[PDB]
């Protein structure tokens, strides 16, 4: 399989790269605004009740639909990563350079953070919820959950969008990528929160001023995404 | 990026333009009939309860599915705007002429209004609900919410349907456009109502004889749509 | 626009036509089995409660997904009508011959009826629910509801599947056709039941031995479907 | 129609075949992890309540989305069967060799079982639920339910993915295949559980150490899948 490529500053500062960074910022902002917004909407409707099944459905569907769109609207400009773990898994398989990937991370983190401060305002100052592992459940269980579900996501990105042999999968790729996240929130929501996405988790941690447990949402997703890049890149593109 | 184009009467009165106006009328009627209808259905089932999470899901899914369809069924005739803010954002980027755009607005407003009078009849005279900003929440918060979510919609229309480089996105564009509205209602419903669409809001205001607060659903969506046209048109098509 | 074509017996008894009839039987059986089945599932889970919002969502989503599939799996064999009103609207615009269309009706009615007797068995003898206009609501209101929502469906079939200029819409047509039915059930369920489909309504009327009010689900859908054929066929294909 | 083909060891041990087996393992693992996971999520949220309508929706949507993805991500490597009954129905119509098909079964069963042991861990040791026929309902009713719904699935796979004349259906095939399972769970969940898939059922039986009634989920799905292969393969591909 293709090796890691560090890239160059010239390449990573080209106008095409700059457009890509803006696209990643915008896609991540819009994804996180909707997705976090659905969780705040549930809190508003229920006066801050514990999550129930209708709420889980609302939040999962919102994230799946919004991520489909966020990926689609960047696909021809940046590739529509919307997610540091996607960028990382792609970098592991030589699909994006390291330098460009770092700038994608910055754009994604900025976009997510912006979305969360916008939410705080437009909702009239409601709390921005953070991802956390369920009460009582171990952190390793949470990490392993996040490894598995993020592996699923990044593997999907490889199979439908990166693979040169994708064929007609390329047309439906944004939808597959969004709806694997939706599906996986329906499973993982009550356990890890169903992040799959360090930026999605980071914005709220900034806006709520609370990084307790936040490491889970870097370690788990990066390992899952990296494992997907290693497996798909070496076996199915190698 | 392309400038605003005023157009001509000859062009805007051509048979092709007249077909486009009828298509916009029909698509907007069917979109608003379903979407408002889902809100009246919730009121019927619950005896006019406050919105809850099942209801929000029902209404969001209905709007997302219905808008997907309404866009698809006009895509090859009018472009499937279904929305004055989409038309406006496209006009800002030179994608539709101003004169033609004004006639699209008329067709959309007429279609929405018609849908709402039809609903009043077929439901046995139930109230046609109007979009309003949540009790206690400021109007600027509501406007800014609508700016953000309408920006998302119009940006999606640009990226998937207008951009000449859309490629395979063009096939899934109607679905992206519908499901961003669905996603954004799941976030915004309990705050602004999740309009994104001055015509969707206007029909009910006419049918309920209540324009209180209605300005929000012109100012917010037009600004969001205009900002999407400015950004995408000048950066990603320029 | 194209006129009505009566067709011929030779044509309507060809092997291609016979395959089409079997495909319509199978698609309609599978559509109605799922869709009615979701309503029986709700009754089982709730001990025959009145419809609530979760139930409406379940039933609407089931029908939208199932109809998408039923249309897709016949699209290249029969055209995937799955619905006497679709067949009728297509016949009005010269898209299927009258003789072939009558045999499609028979196949659809048989498939729906079969599904409903299968359901009665596999559910352990539970009642097969019938479409009815809501208590107190007038029959004309119910008919007009069904006209509007069936117009939407058949117009969608024309715009995405019949029109020679459909282009990329043809790829997503089955999904548009399914999800307009889903959307429209979210609106119409508590009022007319959201049929759009004389066969979908007829199977249960046979299996429950109850044709009270059943005429609504022929008059409303046939008029809507016929109006869609007249408008689209003469304006947008003429 | 094409006959059954036994195949060869050389063919079934080729690198292409080995890649296919890994893809089937991964797709089935990810499908079952999400889908079973959604059922465990419901149990967590509700403290092990009986299934209700929100829960049925959550579980059906999760399975439909996850299966769409699992099929898509194997489509160009293995064909994306994810299901012994799909493999069997395809084998009946000569679309996969018997030897290769047996190895697909092994990969699918292993993947499902792995998913279920992973779930047991990451959820903090919660019970892995098994498919069972509803209390009081006969086993033949359960089998016949599973025949019908699995026929639907495998017929969909033939019509959209196997048929050489699939045309544009091939692009949307993964989505049709996923959403027929979603639809059919909305009908069958409270009666048979809505399996359609011997591997999906088998993983939990292993992880819960409970094979009571499990035969239903081999007999019903294999017969349905085999009947779909016989009908579609001989009539619509013959």
Author numbering:
A (entry chain A), B (entry chain A), C (entry chain A), D (entry chain A): 1 to 238
What do the authors of the reporting publication say about this deposited model?
Tonoplast Intrinsic Proteins (TIPs) belonging to the Major Intrinsic Protein family, also known as the aquaporin (AQP) superfamily, have been shown to conduct both water and ammonia. Crystal structures have established that AQPs are homotetramers, where each of the monomers holds a functional pore created by six membrane-spanning helices (helix 1‒helix 6), five connecting loops (loop A‒loop E), and two shorter helices (helix B and helix E), both displaying the AQP-signature motif Asn-Pro-Ala (NPA).
In the reported structure, 238 amino acid residues are resolved, and only the N-terminal tag and 12 native residues at the C-terminus are not included in the model. Accordingly, the structure of AtTIP2;1 constitutes an open channel where the cytosolic and vacuolar vestibules are connected by a pore lining eight water molecules in a single file. Interestingly, the pore diameter of AtTIP2;1 at the NPA region is smaller than in other AQPs, and it remains constant at around 3 Å throughout the pore. However, the most striking feature of the AtTIP2;1 selectivity filter arises from an unpredicted positioning of the arginine at HEP in helix E (Arg 200), a conserved residue in nearly all AQPs. In AtTIP2;1, the arginine side chain is pushed to the side of the pore by a histidine located in loop C (His 131), which now appears as a fifth residue (LCP) of an extended selectivity filter. In contrast to His 63, the additional His 131 at position LCP in loop C points to the center of the pore and forms a hydrogen bond to a pore-water (Wat 2). In fact, structure and MD simulations concur that loop C leaves enough space for a continuous side pore reaching from the selectivity filter all the way to the vacuolar surface.
